[PDB]
């Protein structure tokens, strides 16, 4: 659903789907080729 975001270090609006990419657990978010936020990890624990 198109909802608002208020994370521990992120704020925006978008649709949260299941990601199939790799990540590092010592980071908060990741960026695509167009330098926009395309992934977010769970502040409570972790989950891009």
């Amino acid at each position: 659903k198109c909802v608002n975001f208020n994370f521990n270090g992120l704020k925006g609006t978008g649709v949260l789907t299941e990601s199939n990419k790799k990540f590092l657990p010592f980071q908060q978010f990741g960026r695509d080729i167009a330098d926009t936020t395309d992934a977010v990890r769970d502040p409570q624990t972790l989950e891009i």
């Binding site: 990419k21 790799k22 590092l24 010592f26 980071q27 978010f29 990741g30 960026r31 080729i33 992934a39």
Partner: protein, 252 residues
């Protein structure tokens, strides 16, 4: 405590060169399949680094610290188990100890009065300082275990460390990989951040020795200390987000 070992011989400081190694992550932001341009405190490629080797042929002078140094160490008998940091390395100023005493990595910034040659002597009793007071920062990291068995031969591990200073914060990068100098490419991951806020100008290596105070010996180990400059790098990310290649703009 104040007296050092008289059976130590200092090796002359010869010079080698690093091929492509010495690239770390500049921030804690994940990137994937991009070509990022950034300028931070890095090592230029094909630059002169100082050669050190411990085999009674010791090599430990007091090296200066302006902005950043690297600790590219190779080990077989685990001699390099700590590093001292500070301004003049005595009790009149603050002195940082990062000591791995085979239980954990003890990080303490007190006023340690160091001797002429601080060294460790498994570990029997770690004593390098005579007095300590007015302490400021304490930290307990992840526990690790070390050994002091005498081994001489081919190296099979590489431990690179980054000690930088930006706005009082001391970031530590680390990379552990198996392999007198390894070649190729690597990438150093962030480990821990230290908000101390002191002034450090000189540093020295804590060499751990084994077997009253005259029959101490050590195995075979080597490390390299360079000098950093704020150069601009190109940063090539793969699909997994790991550093695969780097380009120094002030090289060719």
């Amino acid at each position: 405590q104040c007296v050092n070992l008289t059976t130590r011989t200092q090796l002359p400081p010869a010079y080698t060169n690093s091929f492509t190694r010495g690239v770390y992550y500049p921030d804690k932001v994940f990137r994937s399949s991009v070509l990022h341009s950034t300028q931070d405190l890095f090592l230029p490629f094909f630059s002169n680094v100082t050669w050190f080797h411990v085999i009674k042929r010791f090599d430990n002078p007091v090296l200066p610290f302006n902005d950043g140094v690297y600790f590219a160490s190779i080990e077989k008998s685990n001699i390099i188990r700590g590093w001292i940091f500070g301004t003049t390395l005595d009790s009149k100023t603050q002195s940082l100890l990062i000591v791995n005493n085979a239980t954990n990595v003890v990080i303490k910034v007190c006023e340690f009065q160091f001797c002429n040659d601080p060294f460790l002597d498994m570990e029997s009793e770690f004593r390098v300082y005579s007095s300590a007071n007015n302490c400021t920062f304490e930290y307990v990291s992840q526990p690790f275990l070390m050994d002091l068995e005498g081994k001489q031969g081919n190296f099979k591990n590489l431990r690179e460390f980054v000690f930088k200073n930006i706005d009082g914060y001391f970031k530590i990068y680390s990379k552990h990989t198996p392999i007198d100098l390894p070649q190729g490419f690597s990438a150093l991951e962030p480990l821990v951040d230290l908000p101390i806020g002191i002034n450090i100008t000189r540093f020295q290596t804590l060499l751990a020795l084994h077997r009253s105070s005259s029959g101490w010996t050590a195995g075979a180990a080597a490390y390299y200390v360079g000098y950093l400059q704020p150069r601009t790098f190109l940063l090539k990310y793969n699909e997994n987000g790991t550093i695969t290649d780097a380009v120094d703009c002030a090289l060719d």
